[model samples]
Target: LVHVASVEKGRSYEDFQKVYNAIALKLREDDEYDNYIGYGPVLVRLAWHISGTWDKHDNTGGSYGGTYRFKKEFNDPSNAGLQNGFKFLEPIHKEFPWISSGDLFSLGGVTAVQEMQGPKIPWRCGRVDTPEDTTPDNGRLPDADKDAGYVRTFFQRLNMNDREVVALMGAHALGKTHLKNSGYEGPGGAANNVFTNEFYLNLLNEDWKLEKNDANNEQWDSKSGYMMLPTDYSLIQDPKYLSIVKEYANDQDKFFKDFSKAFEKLLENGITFPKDAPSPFIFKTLEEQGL
Candidate 1:
């Protein structure tokens, strides 16, 4: 059950950077998506959904296999509304067909975060695709309608501790949930496209009312027009998670750094990188390259 890293034939950092730039440019150009929130959020979600399937107990579903291309993973109930992210990457994949689906999917997330002014996630280029049978069954992702204990226990299967879970949940700041997609609706913060610590801030700062949405799901809503899933609000409900949430809410840089590390680890789960594998690449954003 060992999955080894294998860089696509002779492709190096420069080639991947080009692919990153393509995604960034499209992120800038595709301004009309999600009501001008752009493709950044969905792209990040796409990457997360693809990678989130990994189970530490067996290392079956993960970004390593790129089985999302198959129907089971693509049509995963948890993966609803991610087709937009996949459609967005269609052109990039067509242009850079050499990149594995796993690599491109994970890289879309890294590029979106950096381009949206979040963090520099050092990404490894490998993740060769496995067959359709390799796709893990659906319902592997976490449910949004859960609590603090559920959140903590759910991530344990992914091998993430309290700190990593809190830091990774910070991604909630980036996108709004569509009712049609996840049976939840509302942005998590004012800056839906830009990555920030706002999720923690909003969770702590807002006077949230537990209300049922049209989907009949309970979510914490604020007068400020932001919403938090039960799992999101659980950060404050749990004493330990509350402490980390407070820390992230107060320090943006710490959140960014910790999130970068945790997110990279999340994407890299269930894959083994040999000592001989090339060092992970910290890609420069389009802004850094003056693109």
Candidate 2:
């Protein structure tokens, strides 16, 4: 007899296609936030939080376990306000009760990241759900109030080098830091709902001023009506990170290619697949879905 980590054995790609349909539907419905930028920020945070559980040495915490269902993991001080993303996925779970929580939650992150124009993160299907006790302890994610050196040092735990670190954080361009959620605030650009390199353009071209928001925390601000977190601002403040930022800002195609690779790596941190894994699948956006 063979023991497996996931349920729904004998499940095939077509079944996942139905699950994908359900996910795509709700993604359309949940499109509201941060000056109508929609669910982009929390979606990125959801993926980051799921993968942030990795330890590299033992392969302990990561997307594979799908442990975020537990209250302890969800309520971790670092996770603060990600409950919004969880709630966002609840109805989809209710509608299609057959899929595993592990897959659904992780899939939500994957779908959100890709649809937001981040990367074509390749996904796997076998995350087995565990009991509450399996939850990874809190504080695995990074802090928004930190500097570039701190960002670099913290990501080292994830086995990410400087360039990868910058690319991954560039996702900050998609979603804004919610003050209620992250003690930070503001959308990154003029078009938060749609995906584009406007984030890099805004970061480089805008005359940003450091200012305090209504939440009483300081972030980089622009009189042009945009804002950036201290952590986001740290990207250009350091010499090496700045070089990467220049590379991305000058070449959008290069940024998209690098972001795709780094994000796919981030999503697959502790999971393993065969050597012949397929190219990452880029799903059409809700508009393209013709809903």
Candidate 3:
């Protein structure tokens, strides 16, 4: 005597995978974000923020609806310079004219994380496009200048706990802040293009000097041609978060496990699925498929 749910109507797994390939191929080509760090980090951050807007209580604003492409969402000052990520994905969307914006934006996160050598995140399709007025209110993203407390408080609205907060921040390792992008500057790890727990290691091990960038914000700078936003540095300062930071810094596997779980939840925020939803699909990399 068991009950089961059915798959989402209108689209199949193959439908989504084709959309995935379109984004995956383009991400392979769009490699010029901030000093050639590539579109990985900002795209991940865009995906994160779009999904991060979820409020579990009412479930109003989240990746459940693709909203950022709208004029108002585009005008968010906290999202300043993210126009770069939008621009980066524009061509891919044009190529696949049928994909929903919500699907494209969320899947872009999937492509980015997997392309950068992170975990395989099982994703779904079926995010229908919403109108402009449905965009989430601005200022939902965290401020780089904030402290550990502000960082902690900010994410509560998104329903993220300490470990998930620390885990997502590791994404900072992917792309440097452009001063113009986030009012911060410099790459967070040696290989901003390749994903790794290098962000946690660098933050914990590097001797950082507080310096002003061309944008006139005081960010933590390192000798290894890398940098950390004050908020990025805050992870290691808190004892509870420090323990996780040390773990991720030393073990990439553990970091990947935690990151994949946290990232998938982040992207799926506010999206409801029935019990019969399909299992996560691990798409083949372009090289593996000989594409």
Q: Order the candidates by lDDT, highest first.
A: 1, 3, 2
Q: lDDT for model 2, on a 0 to 1 scale?
A: 0.74
Evaluated at residue 104, the lDDT of candidate 2 is 78
Q: For residues 154-252, what per-residue lDDT tens digits would candidate 1 score against the true structure?
A: 899889999999999999998799999989999999989888888988998999999999999999999999999999999999999999999998999
**lDDT digits (tens) for residues 1-291 of candidate 2:** 121345356676666656766776666666665456676567667878888888787677877667888888888888877888888888888887777776777778777766665556666666666667767888777777889999888888889998888777667666666677767777788766555667777888999998888888889989877888887889889999999888888887787778777776776677665445433445555556575
Model 1: how far residue 157 lies from native, Å: 0.9
User: What TM-score should be assigned to candidate 1?
Assistant: 0.99
Model 2 segments beyond 4 Å from truth?
1-7, 33-35, 117-119, 274-291
Off by over 4 Å in 3: 1-9
For residues 1-291, write the lDDT of model 3, one tens digit per residue: 111222346667677777777777777776664667677778888898788767766677788667888888878887787787788778878877777777788888888888788888777666666677778788666777878899898888878899898888888888767766567767787887788888988888889988888888898888888888888888877888899899888898888888888898887777766656677667766666688
In model 1, pairs of residues that clash are none
The TM-score between candidate 2 and the true structure equals: 0.88
* Residue 229's lDDT in candidate 1: 91
Of 2 and 3, which scores higher on TM-score?
3
Clashes of each: 0, 2, 0
